[PDB]
Amino acid sequence: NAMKTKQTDELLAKDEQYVWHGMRPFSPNSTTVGAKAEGCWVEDIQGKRYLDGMSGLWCVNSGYGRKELAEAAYKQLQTLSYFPMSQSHEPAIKLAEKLNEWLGGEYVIFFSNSGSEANETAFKIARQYYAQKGEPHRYKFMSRYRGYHGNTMATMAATGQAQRRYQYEPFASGFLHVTPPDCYRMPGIERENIYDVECVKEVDRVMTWELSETIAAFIMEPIITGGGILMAPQDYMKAVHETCQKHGALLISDEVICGFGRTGKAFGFMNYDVKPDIITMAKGITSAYLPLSATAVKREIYEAFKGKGEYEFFRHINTFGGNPAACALALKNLEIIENENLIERSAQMGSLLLEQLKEEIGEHPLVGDIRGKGLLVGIELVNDKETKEPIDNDKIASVVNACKEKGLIIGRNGMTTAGYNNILTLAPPLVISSEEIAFVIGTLKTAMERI
Amino acid sequence: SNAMKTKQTDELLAKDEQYVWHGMRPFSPNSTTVGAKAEGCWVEDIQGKRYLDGMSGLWCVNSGYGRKELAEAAYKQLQTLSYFPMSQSHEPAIKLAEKLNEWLGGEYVIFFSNSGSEANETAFKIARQYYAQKGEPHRYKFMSRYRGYHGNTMATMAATGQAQRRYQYEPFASGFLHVTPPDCYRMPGIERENIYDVECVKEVDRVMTWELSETIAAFIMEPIITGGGILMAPQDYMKAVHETCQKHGALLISDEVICGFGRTGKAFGFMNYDVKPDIITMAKGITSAYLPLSATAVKREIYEAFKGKGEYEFFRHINTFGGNPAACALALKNLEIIENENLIERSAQMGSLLLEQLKEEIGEHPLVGDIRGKGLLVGIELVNDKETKEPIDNDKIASVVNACKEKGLIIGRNGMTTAGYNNILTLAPPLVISSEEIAFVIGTLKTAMERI
Amino acid sequence: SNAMKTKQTDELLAKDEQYVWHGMRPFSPNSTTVGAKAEGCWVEDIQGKRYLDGMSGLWCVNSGYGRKELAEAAYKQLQTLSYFPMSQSHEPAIKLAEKLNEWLGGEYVIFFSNSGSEANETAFKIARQYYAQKGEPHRYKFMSRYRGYHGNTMATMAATGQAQRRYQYEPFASGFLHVTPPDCYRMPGIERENIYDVECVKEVDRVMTWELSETIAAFIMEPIITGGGILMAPQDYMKAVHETCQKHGALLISDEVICGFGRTGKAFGFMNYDVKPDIITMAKGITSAYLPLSATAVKREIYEAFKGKGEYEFFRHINTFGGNPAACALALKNLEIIENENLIERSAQMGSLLLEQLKEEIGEHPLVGDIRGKGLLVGIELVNDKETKEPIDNDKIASVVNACKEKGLIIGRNGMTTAGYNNILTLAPPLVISSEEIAFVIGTLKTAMERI
Amino acid sequence: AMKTKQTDELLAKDEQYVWHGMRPFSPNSTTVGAKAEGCWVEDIQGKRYLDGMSGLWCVNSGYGRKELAEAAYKQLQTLSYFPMSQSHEPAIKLAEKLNEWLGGEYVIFFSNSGSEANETAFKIARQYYAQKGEPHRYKFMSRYRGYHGNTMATMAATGQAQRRYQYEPFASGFLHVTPPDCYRMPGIERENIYDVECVKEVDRVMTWELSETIAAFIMEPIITGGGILMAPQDYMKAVHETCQKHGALLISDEVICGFGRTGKAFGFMNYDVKPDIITMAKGITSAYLPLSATAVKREIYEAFKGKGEYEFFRHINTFGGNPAACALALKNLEIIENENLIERSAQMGSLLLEQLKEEIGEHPLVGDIRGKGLLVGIELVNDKETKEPIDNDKIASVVNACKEKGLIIGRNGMTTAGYNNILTLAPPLVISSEEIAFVIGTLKTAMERI
Ligand SMILES: [Cl-]
Ligand SMILES: [Cl-]
Ligand SMILES: [Cl-]
Ligand SMILES: [Cl-]
Ligand SMILES: [Cl-]
Ligand SMILES: [Cl-]
Ligand SMILES: [Cl-]
Ligand SMILES: [Cl-]
Secondary structure, eight states: OOSOOOOOOHHHHHHHHHHTTTTSSSSSGGGOOEEEETTTTETTTTTOEEETTTTTHTTTTBBBHHHHHHHHHHHHHTSSSSTTTTTTTTHHHHHHHHHHHHTSSSSEEEEESSSHHHHHHHHHHHHHHHHHHTTTTTTTEEEEOOOOSSSSHHHHHOOOOOGTTTTTTTOOOOOEOOOOTTTSSSSTTTSSSSGGGGHHHHHHHHHHHOOOOGGGEEEESSBBBBTTTTTTTTTTHHHHHHHHHHHTOOEEOOOOTTTTTTTTSSSGGGEEEEOOSEEEOOGGGGGSSSSEEEEEEHHHHHHHHHHSSOSSSOOOOOOOSHHHHHHHEEEEEHHHHHHHTHHHHHHHHHHHHHHHHHHHHTTSTTTTEESSSSSSSEEEEEETTTTTTEOOOHHHHHHHHHHTTTTOOOOEEEETTTOOOOEEEEOOTTTHHHHHHHHHHHHHHHHTTTT | HHHHHHHHHHHHHHHHHHOOOOOSOOOOGOOOOOOEEEEEEEEEEEEEEEETTTHHHHHHHHTTTTTTTHHHHHHHHTOOOOOTTTTEEEEHHHHHHHHHHHHHHHHHHEEEESSHHHHHHHHHHHHHHHHHTOOOOTTEEEEEEEEOOOOHHHHHHHHHOOOOTTTTTTOOOOEEEEOOOOTTTTTTTTTTTGGGGGHHHHHHHHHHHHOOOGGGGEEEEOSSSSTTTOOOOOOOHHHHHHHHHHHHHHHHEETTTTTEEEETSSSSSOOOOTTSSSEEEEEEETTTTTOOOEEEEHHHHGGGGOOOTTTSOOOOOOOOSSSSSHHHHHHHHHHHHHHHHHHHHHHHHHHHHHHHHHHHHHHHHHHEEEEEEESSSSEEEEEEEETEEOOOHHHHHHHHHHHHHHHHEEEOTTSSSSSTTEEEEOOOOOTOOOOOHHHHHHHHHHHTTTTO | OOOHHHHHHHHHHHHHHHHBBOOOOOOOOTTOEEEEEBBTTTEEEEOOOOEETHHHHHHTTOOOOOOOOHHHHHHHHTTTOOOOOOTTTEEHHHHHHHHHHHTTTTEEEEEEESSHHHHHHHHHHHHHHHTTTEEEETOOOEETTTTOOOOOHHHHHSSOOGGGGTTTTOOOOOOOEEEEOOOOTTTTTTTSSSSGGGHHHHHHHHHHHHGHHHGGEEEEEEEEEETTTOOOTTTTHHHHHHHHHHHHTTTHHHHHTTTTTTTTSSSGGGTTTTTOEEEEEEEEGGGGTTSOOOOEEEEEEHGGOOOOTTOOSSOOOOOOSSSHHHHHHHHHHHHHHHHTTTTTHHHHHHHHHHHHHHHHHHHTTTEEEEEEEESSSSEEEEETTTTTTEEEHHHHHHHHHHHHHTTTTEOOEESSSTTTTEEEEEEEEOTTTTTHHHHHHHHHHHHTTTOO | OOOHHHHHHHHHHHHHHHHTTTSOHHHHHHHHEEEEEEEEEEETTOOEEETHHHHHOOTTOOOOOOOHHHHHHHHHTOOOOTTTTTTEEEHHHHHHHHHHHHHHEEEEEEESSSHHHHHHHHHHHHHHHHTTOOOOOOOOOOOETTOOOSHHHHHHTTTGGGTTTTTTOOOOOEEEEOOTTTSSSSTTTTTGGGOOOHHHHHHHHHHHGGGGGEEEEESSSSSSSSTOOOOOTTTHHHHHHHHHHTOEEEEOOOOTTTTTSSSSGGGGGTTTOOSSSEEEEGGGGGTSSEEEEEEEEHHHHHGGOOOSOSOOOOOOOOOOOOOHHHHHHHHHHHHHHHTTTTHHHHHHHHHHHHHHHHHHHHHHHHHEEEESSOOOEEEEETTTTTTEEOHHHHHHHHHHHHHHEEOOOOOOOSSTTOOOOEEEEOTTOOOOHHHHHHHHHHHHHHTOOO
């Protein structure tokens, strides 16, 4: 209830006239213009407040209104605004060292701005690495259907969500896909000996059938998040890594969403006992206060780029990547996550959120499955629990809308896989409290009563 | 003390060698320069050496270093709202989009991205989807010039005409075509001819006809090919290319990543050439590179095609960080600075002075083939022979770049663009550069030229 | 003429080595066999050695060698009209098209090509143009099975799932997808499951969903994967795949290049499996390989889409030699032979006898993993271990192939199809083969098996 | 002979069952060939036509050759099939004979069609480099307005968009350059070849794409189907020298120009070059039976002789090198040689060219008349000054008028949009002076319409 009422009309009119909004139907009258935020709550220009159950876009991990983060950026901006990453600056050096600690070592870090750029960089490094190790023929990249890895032509090629690809094709050749592990739609795969699991055998078979010698890397999120919070058997990622190694290919762990405490570990891959050859990161690295991403590469791979030959080094320049202010802010963000025990709070609040959700709506006739790890949770809505038929779009959409009216931002896997945008997503900021979790669940439960 | 400074430097260099992967350079850990601080046109490393940055970082620190008002703008926004998804909106993005539309001359709708490469990728996707929704799904092809650069991603590398930026990252997608670049130095007299009799202008029309008009989505070009060597076209070239695009039903995308925001002596490069582009891409100088931000400006009529109620009719593209609140608020202040300090006109005037003085000072040098530029954007083409125009040996131009750096000038070079044509020195100093600093640039270069 | 004949053969072999490039083999001039003459199921080389041809040349001499009536048919036509372009027509092409339509069961329109690879290429182009003219230009994708083969050209190799036929000829075009091949030996009990619960059947539907139905033009498959290893599917597999194509709006192409013309005990392989394919491709046995000819049969509803007055509406494709008059006239006589000598039914009955006798004869051999087939089309899968099904060592299966040839039997092998899986012996004898010649085949193989 | 009722039935069967290449669905317009002799063909209704196109640039020795029929028949009675993984005597003898014809020293891979022959050349080029330490060389370069086949890869290499449209997308790695055309680029034939812009373009594009990524440049010596587009004399040699400079191969597409068509055994022989790879089809058998060949320099073949798993050419073409077609081809080459057909092509071709200029050269819509050997293009224009291609109906009416009057003349239809304006003649090499008079007389009268 602001003392002076903000002038919305001009701002709203200007947005509609000049701003192109990603991922949505033209509905200017539905635009939410964010004004301010604190903790887990955001507020629009009209003054309405919402619990942000999505951390913006899976990314505001340390929460909103962090004065410490603002100061870190401010101090750096006053010292040195820019230095090219062909050369170096102290914030980038300190962050690279810090990321190496977080990763468990030993990696060399190339800085980029976005998760899409980080994945593109991983592809180029993989190809040049093999060209310089006497295996020029290895160019192929393999991923899972229903996955996402970016918004560029090559990361869309690697993406398995056709609703993100359609009408932007044709793409380059050399991108292959396999069935995604999903313990809900493939019941009992979790029980099986991992190497008897069909979608695990598929990885090995396709690599054999494509010829090992042509495969550069397998890319995967530890959990398929955007796609629907699809989860694999415990030994899946390790089996995939052993398969890559068998065929001489690299494993790239896409940690763009799972990174920085999201799943209850520093990174998603750490749930699954693997050391990936390349790790890509963005989003939570700065809690999205400033743009920054990174591609961490095993050091043996970096060694291949040290020669005196004309084309032996990485011939790639990213103007803004590794921005000084973003790096300084990221260092402070990592210190916050560590000092406030946000990784373990994610694990614990995540369990509570999962346990409570099942208790509150699990019996609902259109709730097919509730699953998650850390503060990363999917509620799969179905027309029928027996057949697992995805719920009608109209029904899930009305639940997301109802929650917003009531002050809760909840996500949905819209525009990922046709006929399967049936999944509600929660990824709240890691600082979320037990009481705010009660608000989330209470709000959702009430919204569920409309279907 | 120096001894302490030496120790800190070593510790830092050691950490860098161990942990940091540097773009665009041979692995030379000892040679690395760690930036420490900066003010105006000068940067300083951790050991305390100062350099005139004749490159504005990477063609991008247009308003100069040390801008406290830019730091304040970002800080004030970070304290108000640090993040909001661009699927939704926030005031800094809205105000910047409106401001950019003024700068562009209207009427455009702006999609925000982090980098120039992302901005170009966005342009490609918008061009393809626009045609798909206008009844022409078959239009997928993108056309650009050899010796051009448009980004570091698979698709922007496919559109790129610098093979040294592409080699060993192929194969790329099909549907990317290239034509001869206009270069008034290596194609003497093209500037004089009627534009439509110019062979590389006829090439654009011919190739569109021979590929079938109906398959061409867009032609992408920088108004000046900058990274490639500051290659410059006849005055009427860009307008003839636009008219040719329109004839074939294709869009023209002006890549303003480097030429934007006063660099050429106009707000944008295309404004030198009397054309209104369908799409404009921007990055770099938009924030003077203090924070990452880029934009893809699209004509209103193209945007209208994405307003339908159909399932796939909207732009199904999400960029997490693009349009960052702090970067937008900082960009707004940056544009205010450029306007209030008359930096666009200073670029034009200091640019002329730099060009005229360079010619007087080193024009007669036997290995200087050509000096050209527009605004604070200048290339000095070095040759073994002025008659044949044979590019100078790599060692010779490299020694000049290194000699300047020792003498405290950072000058650029078109390294790793086109094989055997790495022979062009580049200057793009910050638009605040003074007459006296220009004298330092030229004096230092002149002295470094004496070693070859 | 003891040394005169030797001089002649030596000379011929020397000229082969210097001038002839052979398909699909390591350079082995001594190894080369020069065919001289043939009759029935037996071929004879220039040195005078005779062999039972257990492979019908290359799966193709279905009616057997030495057919004077086929020679006469070609000769009579060469004397009447040697050539006429298929943009226009000739009577042999018209009569053959009509006869192929009967054999197919109607109602199809036939486009003539020389090879199976060309026939499949033609099918791809027709599928794409069909959808472009049906208001779905976005449909470009082609789907097939890993371990499958569809030709030796860039696009048919892209559709091919045998990497040893592809390696070092890449990169290929995008838009070619592959799924797991049904193989009732390595996936035991899929033949007794409900077809829609079979994982590699569900895979077809899932991948079409995940790629977006609207982008899929066609699924291409042989009814039995022949060159690959005689891999066989559950009875209802092909019908399920067709229903899945129809569900997604895509076409089904039956690759009948090897299975066609009696090979499997039906006129065509798809007829074992109760489907009416949208497109059928044929070559090989159509002329018993006496002359080159192939065909792409397309459903009439599909051909209707190419009858418009629009500029690009017709099939803009010309194949100079395809539908050669002599080859068509010979093919007609060949079809008449197959029908009059009841070669289809004979293939089915002789094929059963061959399969059962092989099981009785070498079934218990410790390295014989599986014996399977349908009609005169049989695979013997050799393994190091019957429990693990590990493919046998290459040197071991190679020695069996060589031992057989030395004793006058040509037996095939799935060499250079799938790495690590080159372990399957293949028999496809001419459909005229007799009980007694089958005894010779099996007896010779049994004796060759002894040595491993 | 065949009563109207029976011909109607045959025509009806064609409509129902036969899919024709390269034409609008016009069942009534279909010509069903019945028989032929020399340069004349006859349809089922009994009408006769001078075939000014040799079928499709291919019936080089003429129709009605009993000796060719006998050669095929004799072989079909001896051995009808043997796999080219192995060998037969007709293939061996032909390979040797083709090597003589080419000038040596080449190794021959047999295919059926020109499209397959070109595909084979692409695969060999790529594997050759992969085995020579340059796996990065995968690109193929060709000219816009050129044609190399009807398959996805040969269409990618093709520069005629009307043969490509709606069959796309194609694979990446196919590049195109401006075609030399001495009519639309006047005075390039007088320039020093290396100052010619479309010659410089080859060198520049190879540099700009990076030499190390280029596998081969493919080109017809004369762009025939595209509209008989002809280059300066030193163009092909300059292109070869440029390929060599960049470490790339030159493939001469001789599918149409081969076997006497241009007045030499092969087109490249007009231009003083020895190509790395030569592809052939059409006239090799005079189109009596299907056969094509890919001739590869000996030194390229040497790279495929190793003991490594993947070192040999892993390519099988079932029908390629058919015994009857090879035996017939051998007799066809003996005929061309014995009857002095290559020389006749040059002589009759010169005659045809000069008489045409005299008869129709002054026609206001005839922009240019050009050719070499029995390969001639007459470019029709709305205006001789601007060279604007003639209206489409106008050239179509001339083609139709000629057929009505018993002459089959060709046209470059469905090649380059807006540029379908060139009439083509490629008559059988045995054509006589008197038949040439008939051709020209018939065309002259047809031109009267427009
Ligand atoms: Cl600064
Ligand atoms: Cl994934
Ligand atoms: Cl905030
Ligand atoms: Cl450009
Ligand atoms: Cl198959
Ligand atoms: Cl004839
Ligand atoms: Cl025979
Ligand atoms: Cl050509």
